Amino acid sequence: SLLVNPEGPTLMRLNSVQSSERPLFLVHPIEGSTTVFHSLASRLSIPTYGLQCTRAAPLDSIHSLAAYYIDCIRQVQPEGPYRVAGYSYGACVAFEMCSQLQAQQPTHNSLFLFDGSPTYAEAETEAICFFVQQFTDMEHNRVLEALLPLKGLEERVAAAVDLIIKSHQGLDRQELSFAARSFYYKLRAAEQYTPKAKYHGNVMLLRAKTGADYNLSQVCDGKVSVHVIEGDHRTLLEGSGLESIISIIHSSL
Numbered sequence: 001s002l003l004v005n006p007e008g009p010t011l012m013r014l015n016s017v018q019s020s021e022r023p024l025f026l027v028h029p030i031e032g033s034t035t036v037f038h039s040l041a042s043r044l045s046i047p048t049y050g051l052q053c054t055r056a057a058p059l060d061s062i063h064s065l066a067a068y069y070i071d072c073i074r075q076v077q078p079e080g081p082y083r084v085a086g087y088s089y090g091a092c093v094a095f096e097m098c099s100q101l102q103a104q105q106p107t108h109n110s111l112f113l114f115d116g117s118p119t120y121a122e123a124e125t126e127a128i129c130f131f132v133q134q135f136t137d138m139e140h141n142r143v144l145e146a147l148l149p150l151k152g153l154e155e156r157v158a159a160a161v162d163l164i165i166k167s168h169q170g171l172d173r174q175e176l177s178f179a180a181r182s183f184y185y186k187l188r189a190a191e192q193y194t195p196k197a198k199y200h201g202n203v204m205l206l207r208a209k210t211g212a213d214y215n216l217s218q219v220c221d222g223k224v225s226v227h228v229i230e231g232d233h234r235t236l237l238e239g240s241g242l243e244s245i246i247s248i249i250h251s252s253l
């Protein structure tokens with residue numbers, strides 16, 4: 001679930017709704033999968049797609065990822081306006097996709113940010129090291145002893161996969177390897193991302209209960225509506241948070 005098939009499809013149907021209504025396109029969080037969206041997708045009365053981060057995705061920058069996701073999206077719906085959402089890391093990518101579409105043009109795209117905005121050797125190790133800790137129970141200092149002395153990113157990814165496998169032999173090595181590696185690149189991409197223009201279109205922030213607009217005022221002119229959703233950073237897309245999100249999506253559209 002914190003893993004994606006690195007040879008899987010980038011664009012995927014999260015529901016099978018058959019309708020002439022414009023699809024909702026949903027951008028993965030940092031983990032890269034669309035698993036988080038399953039409940040939302042199963043409850044929407046609109047065709048919904050998920051974008052997952054695979055080996056095809058250019059993770060050199062948010063710019064390149066956004067342009068690639070736009071490319072995928074066009075194979076389903078050639079022309080905008082588009083209905084795009086992003087959850088947490090995905091909010092930043094969704095923003096850049098809409099910024100790029102705006103630049104390509106008076107645009108009427110719909111943008112929903114689910115608890116995220118244009119956020120966020122040693123940094124390399126702390127990234128892979130944090131990665132290992134999410135897959136194992138291994139104490140911080142023992143992971144850091146295996147990784148810090150190593151001499152590049154690829155040596156650390158390989159050691160990370162080894163350490164995770166020792167704890168969980170049934171995880172695919174190719175998936176673990178892609179996930180460790182891409183995680184570093186996703187962080188790097190984010191760290192180097194700088195919106196180059198104010199977004200004019202309308203943005204809706206849906207931030208979890210547990211500034212107010214996540215600094216969307218410095219990057220966007222148009223009606224930034226902020227709704228607060230019951231739950232924490234994870235649970236706003238399940239249960240009571242979810243049901244309220246669907247209602248807000250259903251009336252905005």
Ligand SMILES: *C(=O)[C@@H](CCCCCC)[C@@H](O)C[C@H](CCCCCCCCCCC)OC(=O)[C@H](CC(C)C)NC=O
Nearest residue numbers: 029030031088089115116117119123126127130134187
């Ligand atoms: C959204 O997806 C984020 C953001 C949460 C806060 C909302 C503000 C937008 C969420 O997944 C949190 C987290 C971010 C990773 C932080 C650790 C970075 C390490 C610092 C080193 C940087 C040096 C380059 O995601 C996670 O904690 C885990 C994701 C990975 C892929 C396992 N989730 C674990 O369950």
